[PDB]
Amino acid sequence: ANLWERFCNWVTSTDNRLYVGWFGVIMIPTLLAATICFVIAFIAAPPVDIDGIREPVSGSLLYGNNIITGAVVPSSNAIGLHFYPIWEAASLDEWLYNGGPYQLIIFHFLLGASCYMGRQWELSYRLGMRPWICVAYSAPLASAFAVFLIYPIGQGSFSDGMPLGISGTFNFMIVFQAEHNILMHPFHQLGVAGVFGGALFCAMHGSLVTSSLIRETTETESANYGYKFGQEEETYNIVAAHGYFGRLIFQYASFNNSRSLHFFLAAWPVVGVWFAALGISTMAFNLNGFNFNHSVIDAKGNVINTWADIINRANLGMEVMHERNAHNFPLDLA
Amino acid sequence: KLGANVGSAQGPTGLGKYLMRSPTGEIIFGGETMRFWDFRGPWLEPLRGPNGLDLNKIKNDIQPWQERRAAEYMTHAPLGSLNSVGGVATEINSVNFVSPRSWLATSHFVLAFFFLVGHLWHAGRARAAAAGFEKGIDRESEPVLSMPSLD
Amino acid sequence: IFGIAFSNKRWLHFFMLFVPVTGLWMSAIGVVGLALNLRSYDFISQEIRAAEDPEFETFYTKNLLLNEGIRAWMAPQDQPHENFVFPEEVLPRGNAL
Amino acid sequence: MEVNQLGLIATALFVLVPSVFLIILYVQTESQQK
């Protein structure tokens, strides 16, 4: 075998402790670059003029932040969607002032994570598995793309992408609510049903299986020793779990088929999160949450407030305060 | 019109209130719209010179039709609610408007995304079926069982 | 793929109970503190620095300005029994908006 | 920055005390007769 064949065999080998593969060939360097840049920046990067108004925001630990307040800060509004690699800057000091690290990190990360998805497909193929775990991973991946790439594209600037930090994430959410009324958007609502529902069904399934574990141990040992890795028989009694849950609600509201049950466990959070992502991705082009401001009016024409109008007052507070030095004209149009 | 010198008017941040430079020096509009300096449109280009927006043309050559068009476009920005209330999220009901650019963009992002999902679904499945394990693992021939342990 | 994996099915399903159940319990504890206004509202070190240094800015201080907007703009209608009358000149607002 | 002066030892003992508890239990399990 020639060197190229040998190389291919190693790359695609099923015997490596961590699978490499062709997607991995792109994934490994890209993720390494984003990770190393992120760590260095989070610790040591100087303040970044996020909104392009010569008002630098400090994100790093050494420059006055803790874990909660710290972030890698989005690139400058003056840059917009322009590509800003290191080599476009006159110097590293310039690169840092303008938020170059943010772009390096999000681009390497989105590429690497896309490749992580591909790699899940690939290993599934090498092992003779069915292929759709990667489809499940498309839901969180799409969500990352929405907040790091699609929202910036729609708004015209990477300065409006989600910051790489805890408090910065909260900032992104609050401004998003001011600008799009996301809580009143049905795709975010489906998202919430997706994650609340996912947590519910996680707990529910965990609890039902745990409840029907077949006795294999004594009281003085963990019941977990009753399962042995790779044993052929199922470790809990699905018939009993179904008898239970079926009587909790009614018979036909409970799954008796383990396959349908597990498909449901996959599909409910995945679909809901797909809609969460599509929410952000469509509010990116300013198709916003439902607007019922002054929808209810009395016989004379007096406005009768509903809870929607209280939401509106909250959103106004957010709107009038955000980026307090960046607007010169009355309408915030992106 | 009120008498401001728009070239020399310094905004609260130190950047020009109306006019500033792009990162490569071109004269562009200020405020948040600094992000949109790549914009080009027939109502704006006549005020454009070699170095970007031209202060002399701005002072002397702006026509009523340009004022009209800029007013029209400013008040038909592609922002609006799902129930077609025009304007920012905090705007009151009155104007029935969501830009066709928004309808078209949003619909086609949704469709393109689900079509990528469909590509993954059918590509993975086609691979599995061509290889012969799309229905599951052969219990008597489970490939992982013939592989050396990872550790 | 990920470096680690479940090998015990019983532990796997127990963990599925543990994670969301414990999360919800933790949120409940925080809300009990909020019943008393015992908030995690501030970082004191942040506030001392920002008070002294008008060039010091983080996402933390940026979010507090948003909170202040919410309070002033929502309170009069959300808390009608207080009979708040906040004249226009006292409302917190950035430039133009 | 004017941090709380007890924060350092609070964090240190928060990490050390339960970590050590776990290490003790693990090592004495390993040394039990196979």
Partner: peptide, 30 residues
């Protein structure tokens, strides 16, 4: 000292990842 503490905890976490992956108790089919 705060920065040192944060970065130390993070570093310990990364080390833990390393041991958890490469020095795990190997899964064994009985």
């Amino acid at each position: 000292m705060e920065t040192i503490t944060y970065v130390f905890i993070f570093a310990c976490i990364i080390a833990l990842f390393f041991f958890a992956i490469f020095f795990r108790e190997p899964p064994r089919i009985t």
